[model samples]
Target: AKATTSVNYACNLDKRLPELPEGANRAQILESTWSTEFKVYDSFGEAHELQIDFARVPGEVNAWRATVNVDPTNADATATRVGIGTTDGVQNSFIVRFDNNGHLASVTDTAGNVTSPAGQVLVQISYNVVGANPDEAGAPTRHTFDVNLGEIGTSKNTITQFSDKSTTAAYEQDGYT
Candidate 1:
């Protein structure tokens, strides 16, 4: 009869932070992959703010999409907003919200429009960017951005479009930063 012996090896490794070039930190390198969740409370005399930043892409055409789930616990909380644009507000960018009658509504800071019936929970919003050459001659390059709102697995509807001359301005700029 023969006896066999086995050896096991165990090791503990600390979480290794990502390495970055000069003047860069792990947070900057990991920002693209970071995500978090929180609830918004719309109570009287109480305020809440949430901000998200999207980095500019190297392209004449680009699009940004977001999926949001909104459920109002009470009828008074019917007004829900899913906005994309500058920190000041949705004026320059686009906003999708619910009307008083629970219908879908889209708004640019100064104007408002209605859209198709939306989901009670799980709505998708998208912004498509189309860059165009300067107006006529001796003008600056213009960018047109359109906002789309729809429900999950449904076709999106164009809510509105806005054009601007600055590539790094309006909603195209560093939204929150």
Candidate 2:
């Protein structure tokens, strides 16, 4: 049977990008880069680990690309995608930019359009709840939600480029079976 629930996640990303050796590839970049992970529930109330990894854009100092995936530790885990809003999500990663002062400047979708402004960013995750049945009205195995971020131009209680260790300062998701 289908179920219902909700949740929200917030965090801060350091301004200093991780150092990488020359000729590094995606595997090396994402191996131990800045990332956040938390568990989310499907329509069947099953929990899965969701991970989003932030990697520096090779030549851009203030540009970053984030990879959103589900259960990267499990060989049989379902795949995941992400985007900037409630629309259809993208398989490719999203871009994030910071201002001169290290405050969040803008967040762009897969196509380079700004949907989440500085201070408040809404990320829509396209997660597949495997084996979860559709509701009475009819649906498939799609479970998508906005894992959110906060803080616009402030250094407090929001996402920022603080030149410190990137950390998950807050985590919450209002979902239950």
Candidate 3:
């Protein structure tokens, strides 16, 4: 997608143990987390790696925060522009909690707002296909997308805090650059 017109993405998560604790290095933290990554295309179909990780919040039970990065450690860096919906225009961290029944209960954004139904988050990205002299990267492509956690009150195609090992049950993105 172009930086002007983003798209939507959905993924299912399983919150389990031996997870990312709190303040580890992004790498080791990701080592402790159930991390996921994939290539996202820019306007000219140039690709960038998107790395996302879920780490335990260390306080309440079933609580965790998310970190999303573009160009990740695998490549260079053109970092953040993210959030749960929007308020301050852009956000990067998401705090998600699950109920006793292992179902998603709430999602708090960087601004401390709770997510309503259809637990999806809108993320903004900095698309830099080329770097070093990052300015040479030229203009950006579509740099935003909806990160869906699936609908509320449902277990099908959605995320949950089950007893199983934390994992991505299903993932998808709908931007072709």
- Indicate which candidate wins on lDDT: 2
Q: How well does candidate 2 match the true structure in TM-score terms?
A: 0.77
> On a 0 to 100 scale, what is the lDDT of residue 56 in model 3?
67
Per-residue lDDT over 61-166 for candidate 1, one digit per residue giving the tens place of the 0 to 100 score: 1221122222322212322233333212223223333233323343232233323344422221222111323447845432221222333222223112123111
Q: Which of 2 and 3 is ahead in TM-score?
A: 2
Please, what are the lDDT tens digits per residue for candidate 2 over residues 31-115?
5368877787666656777777788776566767787777677514465666766436456467777777876677777755565
Best by TM-score: 2
Residue pairs with clashing backbones, model 2: 6-174, 7-173, 7-174, 119-151, 119-152
Give residue 68's error in model 3 in angstroms: 0.8
Clashing pairs in 1: 91-109
Between candidates 1 and 3, the one scoring higher on lDDT is 3
Q: Which stretches of candidate 1 lie over 4 Å from their true place?
A: 1-91, 99-103, 111-135, 151-177
Model 3 worst lDDT run, 10 consecutive residues: 127-136
Q: Estimate the overall C-alpha local distance difference test score of candidate 2.
A: 0.66
TM-score of each: 0.22, 0.77, 0.70
